[PDB]
């Protein structure tokens, strides 16, 4: 017997519902999602880390002339300076007052700390929501990771459980993502080679350990002081440091619909959005017959208290006269009120207590027990308190 | 020098590696309530 439903995507809210065939008894089903994931598929484009200016040593020629020689290094700039007169400690480097020559070479390479201080650029797409569920079906509790693809079932005890598709395609993740310091930022990073000097992309390596890096820093060589040996370089600072200072705080603290962002197997958990549909094939042996479960007689619901708070601030009571003493399930079909107890013990001529939550000020809800229903009414009161720590169970 | 200067490779020590560092924790804030409102009295030690 197939059964379907629509459970909200929300952790802690223990969903409960009952399968109701005719000749067989109600079967309760209690489903608590503990952790609802959202794992994008990710493609790495490049890593960018701090830079180090590599100043090759000055080639000094005295009474001569040198010509540049390209070693094809990242952002190799190469200039020749005339009218130099250096000083080492020993004294002047040569007598030739003019007609001296100083070849300056400067390039740009990736910092030594880039194995461990690197920002990973990502293109995200095609998230696969993945839910951890705690599922109790006739005292046969199970705990299961399930996928909310169309046909990705999980089969325990002969019970076949299919989930999805989700009623929303939302991701807090966009087409362009950066990962750094265990923290995911939503940044419109450029493509390989479209960097600019001063921001994310001034250095671009494919991997953390690659060979070819694209550099652009506005590396300009300057003239050295009279009586000095140095390659004076002016260039743009690390765009990585500026992405760090001006940070645009992470999606861990700026994602909507209440998402908790996490690291390497990138995921956004407990995103309170959407309703997931389920589909349960239940093998017939889990169904007892109504002739062997207590058929009631002459039920009538009262209402001891009703506070329409967020919690189960409602207590209703049912008088009854059954045929045996045992167990049955209870469910309020409408959204007028939601129950806490998915099953109630029943003596022969007892009076049973049921707990619920509501938002209506004048309730009138139909409540099921073993077979037959009851019309439970009353009047509610407001809560004395107006801030809580848990969400709405209704 | 002139010809070919590159003779060998050194290894840089003291590289930036991971671990754990003891960071402070702020004083417990004072939380007053109200209808659709949360009032917070905050008393820090260092900037937070």
């Amino acid at each position: 017997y197939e059964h379907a439903t629509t459970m909200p995507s929300q952790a802690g809210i223990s969903y409960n519902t009952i399968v109701n065939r005719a000749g067989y008894a109600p079967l309760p089903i209690s489903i608590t999602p503990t952790k609802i994931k959202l794992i994008p598929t990710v493609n790495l484009e490049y890593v960018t880390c701090h830079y180090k200016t590599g100043m090759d040593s000055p080639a000094i020629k005295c009474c001569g002339s040198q010509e540049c020689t390209p070693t094809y290094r990242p952002d190799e700039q190469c200039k020749v300076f005339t009218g130099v007169y250096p000083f080492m400690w020993g004294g002047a480097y040569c007598f030739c007052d003019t007609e001296n020559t100083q070849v300056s070479k400067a390039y740009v390479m990736k910092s030594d700390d880039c194995l461990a201080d690197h920002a990973e650029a990502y293109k995200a797409h095609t998230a696969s929501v993945q839910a951890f569920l705690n599922i109790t079906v006739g005292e046969h509790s199970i705990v299961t990771t399930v996928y909310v693809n169309g046909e990705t079932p999980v089969n325990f005890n002969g019970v076949k459980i299919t989930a999805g598709p989700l009623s929303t395609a939302w991701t807090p993740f966009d087409r362009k993502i950066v990962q750094y310091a265990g923290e995911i930022y939503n940044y419109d990073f450029p493509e390989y080679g479209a960097g600019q000097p001063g921001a994310f992309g001034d250095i671009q390596s494919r991997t953390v350990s690659s060979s070819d890096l694209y550099a652009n820093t506005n590396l300009v060589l300057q003239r050295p002081k009279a009586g000095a040996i140095h390659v004076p370089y002016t260039q743009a600072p690390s765009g990585f440091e500026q992405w760090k200072k001006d940070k645009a705080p992470s999606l861990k603290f700026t994602a909507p619909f209440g998402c908790e962002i996490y690291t390497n197997p990138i995921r956004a958990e407990n995103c309170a959005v959407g309703s997931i549909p389920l589909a349960f094939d239940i093998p017939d042996a889990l169904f007892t017959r109504v002739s062997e479960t207590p058929t009631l007689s002459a039920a009538e619901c009262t209402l001891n208290e009703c506070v329409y708070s967020s919690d189960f601030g409602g207590i209703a009571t049912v008088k009854y006269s059954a045929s045996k003493s045992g167990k049955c399930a209870v469910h309020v079909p409408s959204g007028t009120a939601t129950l806490k107890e998915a099953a109630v013990e029943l003596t022969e001529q007892g009076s049973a207590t049921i707990h619920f939550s509501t938002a209506n000020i004048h309730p009138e809800f139909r409540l099921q027990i073993c077979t037959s229903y009851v019309t439970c009414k009353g009047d509610c009161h407001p809560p004395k308190d107006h801030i809580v720590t848990h969400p709405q169970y209704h | 020098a002139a010809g070919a200067t590159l003779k060998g490779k050194l290894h840089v020590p003291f590289l930036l590696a991971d671990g754990k560092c003891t960071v402070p924790l702020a004083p417990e804030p004072m939380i007053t309530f109200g209808f659709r409102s949360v009032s917070l009295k905050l008393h820090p030690k260092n900037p937070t």
């Binding site: 000020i361 407001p382 809560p383 004395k384 308190d385 107006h386 | 209808f35 659709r36």
Partner: peptide
Amino acid sequence: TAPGNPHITHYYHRYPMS
């Protein structure tokens, strides 16, 4: 805990714009 009893100053705090 809107300031009023429906049983007015209620229904203007809770569910405003009315």
